Write a protein that binds this ligand. Structure first.
Ligand SMILES: CCCCCCCCCCCCCCCCCC(=O)OC[C@H](COP(=O)([O-])OCC(O)COP(=O)([O-])OC[C@@H](COC(=O)CCCCCCCCCCCCCCCCC)OC(=O)CCCCCCCCCCCCCCCCC)OC(=O)CCCCCCCCCCCCCCCCC
Ligand SMILES: CCCCCCCCCCCCCCCCCC(=O)OC[C@H](COP(=O)([O-])OCC(O)COP(=O)([O-])OC[C@@H](COC(=O)CCCCCCCCCCCCCCCCC)OC(=O)CCCCCCCCCCCCCCCCC)OC(=O)CCCCCCCCCCCCCCCCC
Ligand SMILES: CCCCCCCCCCCCCCCCCC(=O)OC[C@H](COP(=O)([O-])OCC(O)COP(=O)([O-])OC[C@@H](COC(=O)CCCCCCCCCCCCCCCCC)OC(=O)CCCCCCCCCCCCCCCCC)OC(=O)CCCCCCCCCCCCCCCCC
Ligand SMILES: CCCCCCCCCCCCCCCCCC(=O)OC[C@H](COP(=O)([O-])OCC[N+](C)(C)C)OC(=O)CCCCCCCCCCCCCCCCC
Ligand SMILES: CCCCCCCCCCCCCCCCCC(=O)OC[C@H](COP(=O)([O-])OCC[N+](C)(C)C)OC(=O)CCCCCCCCCCCCCCCCC
Ligand SMILES: CCCCCCCCCCCCCCCCCC(=O)OC[C@H](COP(=O)([O-])OCC[N+](C)(C)C)OC(=O)CCCCCCCCCCCCCCCCC
Ligand SMILES: CCCCCCCCCCCCCCCCCC(=O)OC[C@H](COP(=O)([O-])OCC[N+](C)(C)C)OC(=O)CCCCCCCCCCCCCCCCC
Ligand code: HEM
Ligand code: HEM
Lengths: 30, 51, 46, 171, 54, 124, 53, 307, 426, 129
């Protein structure tokens, strides 16, 4: 029910570990 | 004096009726074969005897 | 054998039980006969 | 309930609350014979009274139960052992000598019925009941039976046991 | 005023509460006013529902 | 009064017991007990045949088709006589043609006249 | 709209449940034949012939 | 298959079977010691849990164990048996207690009954409930279970769904596939020896004649009453063992000499009043109705000679 | 049809009107309105589906462009599409809550026998309709779902013969299959509405708020006194859902499970196989397929789930024998020195701590199965998740076996207490 | 013999008058005559309410809501007593949390542990240093 943040899978959604994904929304607020 | 259970009687009657129905089944099979003979030909000569 | 004849619904003319049922009423059964008895006066016990 | 016993016709009759009398008659003669059923009941069960007996007999041709066989065998054994009246015995002996030129022992009759089994019963009922013609008489109020009086498809198929069940189960 | 075939009260505690007497506003001299107020509250609720339905 | 009908009139009620299971103690009611309520469609589908019929002293005899002709009363006395006379004269002319020959002929004549006038006007 | 829904539903139920109940002794020599010989069930057509025989 | 004498289909009482089963489970084998070690948890989380909930609702284990909730509503078998054998006040009083709680509970949830209702609930002990439960179960078995005979059948309801038409009953029934005839002998039954074992005291094999055995019995009973409030005594009260010993001595017809005559007379009094069947007397009758037609439905006063 | 005794309620217009005008409902709570919530969202689904079907041309090469065109040139097409999707979500939530409530309430007696089979059939039809719509979405996820359904259907015939062609054709989303599946979706949705109406008419026989009889004889009339409460509870549920969605789903988001829907069939012939993810309501099924890599065992489990969801009153029930049935269990290990066991009867609900524990463990197991999608890459190579396997095994054991549903330990403990009390007080 | 039941049994039949129009000469039968056949769901829809009920010495008193509070007992005892005690403790806790706090806590903790272990395995797979 808890998911890691340092594996590249945001909130448990896997498949996007090969690119930067969270900059706009999660890590930083554009 | 041979008092069998109504469970037993029901099961025997059901067995006889199902035997009659499974006897009727091959008629439906033959009707289906005659209706879809090209489909049957395709199925055997595409799966059981591949080119 | 008997199961096969029952399945096909055809009489087995060679069956031993077939002769007894289809025997001529005017003649006795071939290999059977009962015993002959006589009445005895009744007796009461209390 | 009517199904907690070993007689299909008795179960069917117990289902119908206004069918009072049923009897099976066998009337053998010299070079001919009759075997049938007499029914006495209400007019709303006319179709049931018309179709039940032939439906039961044709089902007996197709398949019979060992419970039915043993019940009938025990009944007929008891009937054979229950003759004590001298008038009935004398009449029966006279008729037997008239038609067969001999007296048939009760032991012989018991052996003859005991040799029967399901296969022999099925074959006999196929010979005499399976797909056969009938003689039917209805006497009384025929308001609900006048539509299908003529000897027609329903009557012809009534002798096919399960294949003529349509007109019995509708009531 | 109960029927004569009804005897005394049996020794069973049938009510734990007294809401038949506690739930009272004692407005028997003006009851149609309270009836109108209940109609008005019902009307407001129905009006909200009918706005959504519209 | 405490009686049914208040002691004033007869009621004519009944207890159908079609929502009852037992007669006495765990003895079931016969499933055909509901057919004893006469004159109700819910009792049986055979009540939809509601002709008027009453008769006494009537005896009817019907013979099995297995002892009859396959095609009884076919060509009899001659193909010509049978077919022509019976079929044509005693069915077609006697029942259909005799009834509509005059109105159909009058309508056909009027329609042909109107068609001729319309076609003549179209030609002109 | 929440307060008016509360009014209607819950207040109406609480008002309807403000009943008074009284139980009395009946000893007038009348048997409870209607309790012993009464009762209906819509699913009797399903229960009959199958259940509890 | 061995053919014997015919008999009814249900030849075992549920209550006796469960009594022997619980005796075997709790007082025999490794399961016995496991269950005896697990006793405090079961007492805390089964008996006391339900007891506390029932007391909060103003009820006892009567209303949850004598007749089930699914029996008081929508159970044609229970309704038939009750209408054929029972007086109305049993089910009526149970329903009345339920209604007197839930009338307030539905109006305003989170309802705790006051002390004068909880005290009336707590007045009833578990022994009378056990009497009622055992008597009802035995009566139902004897009068109705021994009369019925299961039969193979399809579904009771006529469902057009094909997934429900083809339902089968009896094909995987253990008793149905174990016995094919009503004359068949019965297999795998409780022995008479183990049936008699369950009739001993449910605490231990110690004897009460020896003074050493009496101490152990008293300790076990004290633990039981401390873990099971309202089951046999009120929490404040104390169990008196002299009366129980007098009961046991009189039941076994041993030497009842060490007991004073007054206590023996009392013990006989409760013994013969706790088994008495209540009977009705015409003490306080109520008026019977004899209705007549009203005045306006009657002819007017006055009649002449009508010559 | 001599095995049919008739219909419980013949469906006629006048009789329906009369029944719904004099129908009464007992006092209840919010936990017993999921059925009417489902009816409301089913009606809304029918209306919004009709509105959507007046604009969907069943051509796979035109559907995305037509959907884009109808959005900008109409005022309510996208609103109705949003309604239709949210109605699917609410239907799943309400149906699962309803099923869980029935399981907890232990509606497994012969009187609840009728309401169970119809409900399970309705649930299967609902899932089939949902699958049809998901295929109609016409994206890469639609293609994957169609391929999975075609493979599972062909496994029945063992891969011999093209028996699937009449519905699926070549297992792709071409015009013929699009037309067939769209028309099937519409017709089966209306049949679903009818089946749900039948099931909901089959409710009045045994209707209860809680598992405890309340003993109340007066009840409210349905048309206003209960309909108003149903509508208000629906409003409150919608408000709670709105709050949770607003404060739980910020926009934009870093990652979503709906990014797999970017691919359009035909336009994009390249599929991103890494981020394969269905909607949350088929996530448990995809998780089960990923966890159990065997094709036959996975299909068997998928079928067996519905097979044991149906037959529930058969496995657990009175069976008309008044708890005199002798069941076969090996878990007792001959503790009471017997093979066959009498079925217990003291299975209460509101005060059964063991029953509550087992039920809530089962519910949390279902939630954990739904919680996440196992990453099919390196899943079984890193030994996977033990919790997912435990949850699946517990769900199958709980739904199938009767060991935990109606335990024998409480019954025997109650008899032990009864025997001790009766021995102490003769 | 020429009687109902053939002189052997009692039949218990009835004439429904459902398919009849006239009582005497041109006198119609009453419209609600068919309701006099008791125990028949075909005569009324109220027969679907078949709860078992019987009592004989009972009296019930009900009062018009127009003489009662619009919102009775709504905030008796104040915010603290009514809301906090009654709602939270007596309803929410006592009826829900007692039943499921333990299994839900166990399931949540076990699921968190298993998810953390699975994620740690994923991290070991991805990162080699
Ligand atoms: C086609 C099959 C369905 C036909 C339904 C009736 C059609 C109208 C004619 C008629 O007699 O009406 C009277 C009929 C009422 O007769 P009934 O005897 O009460 O039947 C209902 C049962 O008794 C209700 O009792 P039940 O619970 O036992 O039966 C539930 C269900 C169970 O049926 C099934 O499970 C069979 C179908 C699924 C098989 C897998 O049965 C039905 O839905 C009726 C099937 C006949 O009316 C209806 O059924 C309502 C029809 C209108 C509402 C729905 C409209 C949308 C279209 C629905 C069908 C969609 C096509 C399905 C096949 C093609 C795609 C696969
Ligand atoms: C959607 C969430 C809300 C669900 C709902 O209807 O809540 C109303 C429900 C009020 O219903 P009620 O009239 O009290 O029904 C209980 C009666 O005493 C009747 O009690 P009973 O003895 O008949 O059975 C009680 C048993 C009955 O349990 C069942 O029937 C289980 C199946 C129903 C669905 C359970 C879903 C649980 C998971 C939801 C999230 C996914 O448990 C409950 O009713 C517990 C309340 C519902 C589950 C716990 C709250 C989930 C909140 C989720 C976040 C928002 O709310 C609560 O009980 C609040 C509990 C505390 C919530 C905050 C702390 C956690
Ligand atoms: C979940 C949430 C649940 C919430 C439940 C309700 C919370 C408490 C509300 C107040 C209360 O206790 O009302 C009971 C109270 C009835 O009192 P009762 O229990 O019969 O006490 C008997 C007394 O002797 C009093 O006897 P009475 O003869 O004076 O009857 C009182 C009743 C008589 O008047 C009516 O029935 C008026 C009918 C509607 C008129 C238009 C209203 C708009 O109302 C009034 O007299 C109110 C006059 C107008 C006040 C307007 C205040 C807001 C101005 C903006 O009902 C009202 O006061 C009527 C409603 C007035 C306010 C409605 C909207 C309130 C909330 C608005 C904001 C919502 C934010 C979210
Ligand atoms: C070969 C046996 C054929 C046979 O007897 O069929 C009828 C029997 C029973 O059917 P039945 O009972 O309907 O046939 C009528 C039988 N008599 C003449 C006695 C009335 O067997 C079957 O129908 C079962 C299948 C038969 C064998 C497989 C065929 C494919
Ligand atoms: C298994 C063998 C299947 C063989 C092919 C299908 C045979 C179906 C037989 C059938 O429908 O019999 C009529 C029976 C009963 O139909 P019925 O009761 O409507 O027929 C009345 C009887 N007649 C018409 C002969 C007067 O159908 C069923 O029992 C349901 C379908 C068959 C279910 C069992 C086999 C699967
Ligand atoms: C209801 C629909 C039934 C469809 C069906 O039976 O198709 C047979 C299908 C039809 O397949 P087919 O080979 O006739 O056609 C598939 C489509 N094309 C022409 C493009 C190859 O045939 C089989 O399943 C083979 C066995 C048939 C006989 C049994
Ligand atoms: C303990 C509770 C902790 C707090 C709640 C956390 C959320 C838990 C639920 C959840 O993740 O919901 C996500 C979904 C939301 O969808 P979502 O997928 O967008 O959720 C986000 C998920 N993560 C965190 C991975 C990004 O929640 C809902 O839709 C609301 C609740 C719906 C409940 C549905 C129950 C279904 C039951 C299925 C049973 C099993 C069927 C198959 C059986 C086997 C067959 C072979
Ligand atoms: C309660 C019954 C119904 C259910 C469960 C249902 C389910 C669904 C689902 C799951 C989708 C896919 C939406 C998505 O992408 O998440 C969908 C789409 C669709 N449904 Fe339904 N549906 C129902 C009723 C109907 C009806 C009655 C119609 C037509 C009259 C209909 C027509 C459509 C259409 C056209 C789409 C595609 C819309 C689009 O792609 O823009 N549905 N449905
Ligand atoms: C998952 C399969 C389902 C099963 C096993 C099922 C079973 C049941 C049962 C046993 C009841 C009776 C509840 C009680 O006795 O108190 C019931 C009630 C009800 N069900 Fe279902 N059901 C299912 C799905 C559905 C669905 C999908 C719907 C909506 C179409 C539905 C609509 C209803 C309604 C309306 C009620 C009456 C309760 C109410 O109105 O609040 N059920 N169901």
């Amino acid at each position: 029910f808890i998911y890691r943040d340092d594996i590249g899978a945001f909130w448990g959604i896997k498949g996007y570990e090969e690119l930067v994904t969270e900059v706009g929304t999660h890590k930083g607020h554009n | 004096m041979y008092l069998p259970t109504f469970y037993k009687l029901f099961h025997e009657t059901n067995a006889f009726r199902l035997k009659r129905y499974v006897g009727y089944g091959p008629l439906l099979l033959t009707w289906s074969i005659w209706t879809l003979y090209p489909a049957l030909y395709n199925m055997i000569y595409s799966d059981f005897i591949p080119p | 054998r008997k199961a096969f004849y029952d399945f096909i619904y055809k009489d087995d003319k060679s069956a031993e039980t077939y002769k007894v049922t289809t025997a001529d009423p005017r003649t006795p059964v071939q290999g059977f006969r009962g015993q002959t008895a006589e009445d005895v006066a009744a007796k009461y016990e209390v | 309930t009517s199904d907690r016993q070993y007689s299909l016709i008795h179960k069917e009759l117990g289902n119908l609350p206004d069918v009072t009398i049923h009897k099976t008659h066998y009337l053998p003669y010299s070079d001919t014979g009759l075997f049938g059923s007499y029914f006495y009941g209400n007019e709303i069960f006319g179709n049931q009274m018309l179709f039940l007996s032939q439906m039961i007999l044709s089902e007996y041709a197709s398949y019979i139960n060992q419970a039915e066989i043993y019940r009938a065998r025990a009944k007929y054994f008891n009937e054979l052992l229950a003759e004590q009246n001298s008038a009935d015995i004398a009449s029966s002996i006279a008729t037997q000598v008239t038609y067969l030129n001999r007296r048939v022992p009760r032991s012989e009759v018991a052996k003859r019925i005991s040799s029967l089994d399901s296969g022999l019963i099925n074959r006999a009922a196929t010979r005499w009941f399976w797909d056969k013609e009938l003689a039917i008489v209805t006497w009384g109020p025929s308001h609900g039976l006048i539509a299908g009086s003529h000897y027609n498809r329903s009557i012809k198929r009534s002798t096919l046991g399960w294949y003529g069940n349509t007109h019995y189960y509708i009531v | 005023s109960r029927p004569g075939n009804f005897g005394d009260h049996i020794d069973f505690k049938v009510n734990i509460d007294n809401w038949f007497d506690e739930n009272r506003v004692h407005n028997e001299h003006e009851t149609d006013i309270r009836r109108t107020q209940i109609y008005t509250l019902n009307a407001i609720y129905y009006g909200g529902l009918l706005s959504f339905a519209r | 009064m405490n009686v049914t009908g208040a002691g004033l009139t007869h009621v004519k009620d009944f207890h159908s017991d079609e929502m009852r299971v037992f007669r006495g103690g765990l003895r079931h009611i016969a499933d055909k007990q509901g057919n004893l309520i006469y004159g109700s469609v819910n009792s049986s589908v055979r009540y939809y045949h509601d002709k008027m019929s009453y008769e006494r002293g009537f005896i009817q005899h019907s013979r099995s088709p297995s002892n009859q002709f396959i095609n009884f009363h076919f060509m009899l006395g001659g193909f010509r006589t049978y077919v022509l006379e019976r079929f044509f004269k005693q069915v077609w002319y006697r029942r259909n043609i005799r009834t509509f020959w005059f109105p159909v002929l009058i309508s056909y004549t009027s329609g042909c006249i109107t068609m001729r006038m319309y076609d003549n006007n179209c030609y002109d | 709209i929440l307060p008016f829904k509360y009014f209607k539903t819950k207040a109406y139920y609480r008002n309807l449940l403000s009943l008074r109940w009284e139980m009395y002794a009946v000893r007038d020599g009348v048997y409870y034949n209607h309790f012993k010989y009464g009762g209906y069930n819509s699913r009797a057509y399903q229960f009959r012939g199958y259940f509890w025989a | 298959r061995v053919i014997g004498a015919p008999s009814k289909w249900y030849n075992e009482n549920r209550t006796e079977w469960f009594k022997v089963a619980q005796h075997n489970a709790f007082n025999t084998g490794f399961s016995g010691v496991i269950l005896r070690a697990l006793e405090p948890l079961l007492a805390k989380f089964i008996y006391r849990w339900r007891l506390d909930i029932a007391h909060q609702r103003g009820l006892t284990l009567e209303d949850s164990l004598l007749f089930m909730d699914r029996e008081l509503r929508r159970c044609y078998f229970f309704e038939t048996v009750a209408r054929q054998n029972l007086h109305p006040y049993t089910v009526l009083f149970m329903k009345k207690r339920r209604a007197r709680y839930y009338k307030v509970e539905r109006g305003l949830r989170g309802f705790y009954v006051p002390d004068w209702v909880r005290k009336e609930a707590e007045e009833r002990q578990l022994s009378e409930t056990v009497d009622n439960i055992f008597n009802w179960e035995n009566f139902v078995y004897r009068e109705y279970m021994s009369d019925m005979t299961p039969i193979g059948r399809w579904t009771s309801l006529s469902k057009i769904t094909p997934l429900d038409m083809f339902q089968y009953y009896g094909l995987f029934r253990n008793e149905a596939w174990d016995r094919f005839f009503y004359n068949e002998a019965f297999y795998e039954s409780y022995s008479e020896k183990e049936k008699q074992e369950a009739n001993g005291n449910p605490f231990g094999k110690f004897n009460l004649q020896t003074a050493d055995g009496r101490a152990q019995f008293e300790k076990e009973v004290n633990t039981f009453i401390e873990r099971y409030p309202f089951a046999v005594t009120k929490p404040g009260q104390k169990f008196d063992f002299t009366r129980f010993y007098a009961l046991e001595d009189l039941a076994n017809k041993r030497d009842t000499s060490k007991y004073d005559p007054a206590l023996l007379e009392s013990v006989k009094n409760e013994l013969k009043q706790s088994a008495a069947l209540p009977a009705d007397n015409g003490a306080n009758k109520t008026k019977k109705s004899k209705p007549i037609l009203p005045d306006w439905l009657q002819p007017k006063f006055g009649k002449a000679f009508q010559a | 049809m001599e095995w049919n005794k008739g219909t419980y309620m013949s469906t006629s217009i006048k009789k329906i009107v009369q029944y719904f005008s004099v129908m009464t409902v007992s006092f209840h709570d919010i936990n017993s309105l999921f059925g009417f919530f489902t009816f409301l969202t089913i009606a809304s689904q029918l209306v919004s589906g009709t509105m959507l079907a007046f604009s969907l041309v069943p051509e796979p090469m035109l559907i995305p462009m037509v959907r884009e065109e109808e959005d900008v040139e109409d005022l309510y097409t996208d609103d109705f599409f949003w309604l239709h999707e949210r109605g699917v979500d609410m239907l799943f939530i309400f149906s699962y809550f309803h099923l869980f409530r029935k399981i907890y309430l232990n509606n497994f007696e012969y009187e609840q026998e009728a309401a169970w089979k119809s409900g399970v059939f309705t649930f299967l039809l609902f899932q089939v309709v949902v699958f049809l719509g998901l295929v109609l979405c016409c994206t890469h996820l639609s293609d994957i779902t169609l391929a999975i359904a075609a493979n599972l259907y062909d496994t029945f015939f063992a891969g011999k013969g093209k028996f699937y062609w009449w519905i699926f054709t070549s297992k792709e989303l071409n015009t013929d299959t699009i037309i067939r599946l769209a028309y099937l979706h519409y017709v089966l949705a209306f049949f679903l509405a009818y089946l749900g109406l039948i099931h909901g008419v089959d409710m009045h026989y045994d209707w209860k708020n809680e598992s405890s009889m309340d003993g109340l004889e007066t009840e409210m009339i349905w048309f206003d006194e209960a309909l108003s409460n149903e509508l208000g509870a629906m409003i409150e549920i919608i408000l709670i859902v709105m709050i949770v969605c607003f404060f739980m789903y910020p926009e934009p988001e870093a990652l979503s499970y709906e990014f797999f829907m970017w691919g359009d069939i035909g336009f994009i012939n390249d599929v991103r196989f890494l981020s394969v993810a269905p909607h949350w309501y088929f996530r448990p099924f995809m998780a089960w397929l990923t966890v159990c890599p065997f094709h036959k065992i996975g299909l068997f489990g998928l079928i067996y789930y519905f097979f044991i969801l149906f037959y529930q009153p058969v496995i657990h029930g009175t069976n008309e024998q008044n708890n005199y049935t002798k069941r076969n269990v090996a878990f007792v290990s001959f503790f009471i020195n017997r093979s066959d066991i009498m079925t217990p009867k003291y299975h209460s609900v509101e005060d059964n701590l063991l029953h509550q524990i087992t039920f809530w463990l089962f519910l949390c197991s279902a939630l954990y199965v739904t919680s996440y999608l196992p990453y099919g890459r390196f899943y079984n190579r890193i030994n996977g998740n033990y919790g997912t396997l435990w949850s699946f095994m517990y769900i199958f054991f709980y739904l199938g076996n009767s060991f935990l549903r109606r335990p024998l330990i409480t019954e025997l403990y109650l008899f032990n207490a009864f025997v001790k009390s009766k021995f102490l007080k003769k």
